[PDB]
Design an enzyme around this catalytic site. Structure first.
Site, short mmCIF file in Angstrom:
data_model
loop_
_atom_site.label_atom_id
_atom_site.label_comp_id
_atom_site.label_asym_id
_atom_site.label_seq_id
_atom_site.Cartn_x
_atom_site.Cartn_y
_atom_site.Cartn_z
CD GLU A 35 3.22 -2.44 -3.56
OE1 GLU A 35 2.09 -1.95 -3.79
OE2 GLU A 35 3.40 -3.34 -2.72
CG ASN A 46 -6.17 -0.54 0.65
OD1 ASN A 46 -5.74 -1.07 -0.37
ND2 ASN A 46 -5.43 0.29 1.39
CG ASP A 48 -8.99 -0.80 5.45
OD1 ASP A 48 -8.89 -0.16 4.38
OD2 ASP A 48 -8.04 -0.90 6.25
CB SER A 50 -6.95 2.61 4.33
OG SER A 50 -6.86 1.24 3.94
CG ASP A 52 -2.53 1.07 -0.49
OD1 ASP A 52 -2.52 1.24 0.75
OD2 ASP A 52 -2.86 0.00 -1.01
CG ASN A 59 -2.87 1.40 4.05
OD1 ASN A 59 -3.77 2.19 4.33
ND2 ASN A 59 -3.10 0.11 3.83
#
Length: 128
Positions: A35, A46, A48, A50, A52, A59
């Site tokens: 990750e 991301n 959309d 958002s 991380d 998220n």
């Protein structure tokens, strides 16, 4: 901070993750590796809108507040910036809530695609 493999394992063990909800320590180290490459300061945006954050790439859509994801939840009750600390306590506590919400570690795409079904114990081999 960029953790060492064995260094991170020891840190995660101390914080109560070994066999938490049935997942051995090797699972958690494998997920951190793919990750974030063991880097507490990692961020990724991301599609959309958002973002991380941190060592386990948590998220902003559901788990933390970063002030720029409209209509999102803050289920871990923290600012997202607290997840980038050299101290992994806030990330561990939030992850405990995530893996308990019904879907286990399948919430982490890189665990599902690169750790699941593999010899995860290899990730803690050699560590004291």
């Amino acid at each position: 901070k960029v953790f060492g493999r064995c260094e991170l394992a020891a840190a995660m063990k101390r914080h109560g993750l070994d066999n938490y909800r049935g997942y051995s320590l090797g699972n958690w180290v494998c997920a951190a590796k793919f990750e974030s490459n063991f880097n507490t300061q990692a961020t990724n945006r991301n599609t959309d809108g958002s973002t991380d954050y941190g060592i386990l790439q948590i998220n902003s859509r559901w788990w933390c507040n970063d002030g720029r994801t409209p209509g999102s939840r803050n289920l871990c009750n923290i600012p997202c910036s607290a997840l980038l600390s050299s101290d992994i306590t806030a990330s561990v506590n939030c992850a405990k809530k995530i893996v308990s919400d019904g879907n286990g570690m399948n919430a982490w795409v890189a665990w599902r695609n690169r750790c699941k079904g593999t010899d995860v114990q290899a990730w803690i081999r050699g560590c004291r």
